[PDB]
Amino acid sequence: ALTTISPHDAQELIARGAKLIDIRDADEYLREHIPEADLAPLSVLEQSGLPAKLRHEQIIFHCQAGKRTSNNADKLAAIAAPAEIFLLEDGIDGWKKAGLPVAVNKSQ
Prior knowledge:
Elements: H1 7-13, E1 19-22, H2 27-31, E2 38-39, H3 42-45, E3 59-61, H4 73-79, H5 93-98
Parallel strand pairs: 1-2, 1-3
PDB class: membrane protein
Keywords: Rhodanese domain, membrane protein
Assembly: monomeric
């Protein structure tokens, strides 16, 4: 189930149900955000693990910017998987790839 997907086709699923996690940091969420994602850095994952609220049949993973999700898809898998998991191509860079502005606004 571990695979990558463009931010183009992802921009849909995400707006369909695809639950994306923020296996990066918290500070990030502050400044920038992402196309549908809830705070949940690998630091919390190891401290807890794939949450329920974000346990939708299908979910996705990302990061600040590095695309090192597949590099650790081993654990993340045993964390999320077999729950249909994926990767937004590149860490954030993807969402931006297509040229989509993140939730860079407090309160909104």
